[PDB]
Amino acid sequence: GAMFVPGPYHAPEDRWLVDLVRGHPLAQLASNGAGGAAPHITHVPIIVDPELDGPVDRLVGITLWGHMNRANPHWAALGGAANVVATFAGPNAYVSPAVYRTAPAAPTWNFTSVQVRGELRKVESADDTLATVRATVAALESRFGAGWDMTGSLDYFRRILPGVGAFRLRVAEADGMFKLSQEQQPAIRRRVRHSFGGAEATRAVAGLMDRLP
Amino acid sequence: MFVPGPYHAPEDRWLVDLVRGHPLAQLASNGAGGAAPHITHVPIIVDPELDGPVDRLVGITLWGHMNRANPHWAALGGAANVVATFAGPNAYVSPAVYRTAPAAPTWNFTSVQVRGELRKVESADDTLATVRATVAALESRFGAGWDMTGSLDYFRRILPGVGAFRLRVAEADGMFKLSQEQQPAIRRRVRHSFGGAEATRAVAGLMDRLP
Ligand code: HEM
Ligand code: HEM
Ligand SMILES: N[C@@H](CCCNO)C(=O)O
Structure with missing residues (x-):
C-alpha cells in the first residue's frame, strides 16, 4: 500500500475508517511541492458524499467533499x-x-x-x-x-462565496492505522485500557481499545 | 505554509511550545512520479543538546525516528x-x-x-x-x-529496525486560528463556551494567552 500499517494495527472492519473520517473531519491535505520542494499541507474540512444513501462501510469508491481558501497558494499549486x-x-x-x-x-x-x-x-x-x-x-x-440554524445566513454564505475553493476527492485507496496496544500480551493491553479509562483526555482511546475483538 | 495575518503566533516561542506539546508529527515527502505524498506519524523532539531557552525553530535541528521497514524510509x-x-x-x-x-x-x-x-x-x-x-x-x-535504565539492553536488541533522522529546520510556520478575526466580545463568548468542557479547555487556554 501507499501507507505502512503493520499487521496488528489494521482496523477490525472497514467501517472504523469511515467512523474516524466522520469523527475528525479537519484533515491534513498533502500534494507534492514544485521542483523538489516539500509537500504543501493544508488543514481542510472534509465530509463523505452527503448524497450517499445506504450504510457507508468502505471509503474506497466514494467521493469526499471539501473546501479551502482560493488565496492559499496550495489551491493554484x-x-x-x-x-x-x-x-x-x-x-x-x-x-x-x-x-x-x-x-x-x-x-x-x-x-x-x-x-x-x-x-x-x-x-x-x-x-x-x-x-x-x-x-x-x-x-x-x-x-x-x-x-445553530444556518437559515438566517444562507444569503450571507452567497455574499462571501468567492473565497471558497471547493473540491471532490474520489477515494482510490484508503489505509487505516489503529495503534491500540494490539502488539502487547492481553493482560498488558487490559492495563493500558484501564489506565486510559481513568482520564477524559485518554477515554476515547480506551473506547476503541474496548471495541477490539 | 499559508497562514492569514490574524492567525500568526504572538511570539516565536509558541511554535516551539506546540512542537514540545505535540511530538507525534505527520512527516510528509514528495510521492514518486506525481503520486500523492508519503505520510508517516513519527515522534519528533527538539535537539536535546540545546541548553537554554529555545525561542525560535528556524536554525535548530529536530530529532526523530520511524520504522526502517516503512517504505517511506527507502523513498x-x-x-x-x-x-x-x-x-x-x-x-x-x-x-x-x-x-x-x-x-x-x-x-x-x-x-x-x-x-x-x-x-x-x-x-x-x-x-x-x-x-x-x-x-x-x-x-x-x-x-x-518510568526509568529507561533497566531496559537499555532491550533498546539495543531492537535498535536495528530504527530509522532515526535529523531535520535542519529551514522554514517554520504556525497557524494559531483562535477566533482573532471576530470582534472582542465574540472572541470572549467563544473562549467562555470552550472553558466548560475538557475537549475544548486547551483551546480556551491559548485564547486566554493571546494579548
Ligand atoms: C461548517 C464548518 C466549516 C469549517 C470547519 C470550515 C473550515 C475552513 C478552513 C479551515 C478554511 C481555511 C482553508 C485554507 O487554509 O486553505 C476555510 C476557508 C473558507 N471557508 Fe470554510 N469552513 C466551514 C464552513 C464554511 C461556510 C459555511 C462558509 C460559507 C461560505 C465558508 C467560507 C469559507 C471561505 C470564504 C473561506 C476562504 C478563507 C476565508 O475567507 O476565511 N466556510 N474554511
Ligand atoms: C519514547 C517514545 C517513542 C515513541 C513515541 C515511538 C514511536 C514510534 C513510532 C510511531 C514508530 C512507527 C513509525 C513508522 O510507522 O514508520 C516507531 C518505530 C520504532 N521505534 Fe519507536 N518510539 C519511541 C521510543 C522508542 C524506543 C526507546 C525504541 C528503542 C530501541 C524504539 C524503537 C523503535 C523501533 C525498532 C521501531 C521500528 C518499528 C517497530 O519495530 O515496530 N522506539 N516508534
Ligand atoms: N514497537 C516497539 C515499541 C518501542 C517503541 N516504538 O517501536 C516494541 O514493542 O518493541
Whole structure:
C-alpha cells in the first residue's frame, strides 16, 4: 500500500475508517511541492458524499467533499487533476511503560489515522461551491455544534462565496492505522485500557481499545 | 505554509511550545512520479543538546525516528526536502456561541509546519541517542516517571529496525486560528463556551494567552 500499517494495527472492519473520517473531519491535505520542494499541507474540512444513501462501510469508491481558501497558494499549486493524500487523525495517547508494570519495555504512542488517496477535482461552479459549504455545515453542526440554524445566513454564505475553493476527492485507496496496544500480551493491553479509562483526555482511546475483538 | 495575518503566533516561542506539546508529527515527502505524498506519524523532539531557552525553530535541528521497514524510509533517500506538521488543540466553533447573525461556522486549530532537509542517521550511537532523548523528553511531559535504565539492553536488541533522522529546520510556520478575526466580545463568548468542557479547555487556554 501507499501507507505502512503493520499487521496488528489494521482496523477490525472497514467501517472504523469511515467512523474516524466522520469523527475528525479537519484533515491534513498533502500534494507534492514544485521542483523538489516539500509537500504543501493544508488543514481542510472534509465530509463523505452527503448524497450517499445506504450504510457507508468502505471509503474506497466514494467521493469526499471539501473546501479551502482560493488565496492559499496550495489551491493554484493543485493545478488540474492532482494526486493527493488527506490524513484524518483520531484519538491518541502517550503510553508510559509504567502502565505496563513490566520489564524490560519501551514506551509508544497509541494513535488512529486514516489516509485516503485519489485525484483532487476542483469545483468551479458557484452552485457546487455553495452545495459544498451548506453540506459541510449540515454534517459538522449536527455532530460537533450547538444546534445553530444556518437559515438566517444562507444569503450571507452567497455574499462571501468567492473565497471558497471547493473540491471532490474520489477515494482510490484508503489505509487505516489503529495503534491500540494490539502488539502487547492481553493482560498488558487490559492495563493500558484501564489506565486510559481513568482520564477524559485518554477515554476515547480506551473506547476503541474496548471495541477490539 | 499559508497562514492569514490574524492567525500568526504572538511570539516565536509558541511554535516551539506546540512542537514540545505535540511530538507525534505527520512527516510528509514528495510521492514518486506525481503520486500523492508519503505520510508517516513519527515522534519528533527538539535537539536535546540545546541548553537554554529555545525561542525560535528556524536554525535548530529536530530529532526523530520511524520504522526502517516503512517504505517511506527507502523513498526519503538522502537529502529529501520534508515538512513535519505538529497538530495542537482544536475545536469546532458553532455560531450559536457567537449569538450574532449572519455567521458561518469554523474550526479553531493550531498547527506548526517545519520544512528542511531530512538526513538519515546510520550511526548505532546516534540512533540509540535518538530513542533515549525521545524517552527522556516524552516520559517527562506525558509519562509517569518510568526509568529507561533497566531496559537499555532491550533498546539495543531492537535498535536495528530504527530509522532515526535529523531535520535542519529551514522554514517554520504556525497557524494559531483562535477566533482573532471576530470582534472582542465574540472572541470572549467563544473562549467562555470552550472553558466548560475538557475537549475544548486547551483551546480556551491559548485564547486566554493571546494579548
Ligand atoms: C461548517 C464548518 C466549516 C469549517 C470547519 C470550515 C473550515 C475552513 C478552513 C479551515 C478554511 C481555511 C482553508 C485554507 O487554509 O486553505 C476555510 C476557508 C473558507 N471557508 Fe470554510 N469552513 C466551514 C464552513 C464554511 C461556510 C459555511 C462558509 C460559507 C461560505 C465558508 C467560507 C469559507 C471561505 C470564504 C473561506 C476562504 C478563507 C476565508 O475567507 O476565511 N466556510 N474554511
Ligand atoms: C519514547 C517514545 C517513542 C515513541 C513515541 C515511538 C514511536 C514510534 C513510532 C510511531 C514508530 C512507527 C513509525 C513508522 O510507522 O514508520 C516507531 C518505530 C520504532 N521505534 Fe519507536 N518510539 C519511541 C521510543 C522508542 C524506543 C526507546 C525504541 C528503542 C530501541 C524504539 C524503537 C523503535 C523501533 C525498532 C521501531 C521500528 C518499528 C517497530 O519495530 O515496530 N522506539 N516508534
Ligand atoms: N514497537 C516497539 C515499541 C518501542 C517503541 N516504538 O517501536 C516494541 O514493542 O518493541
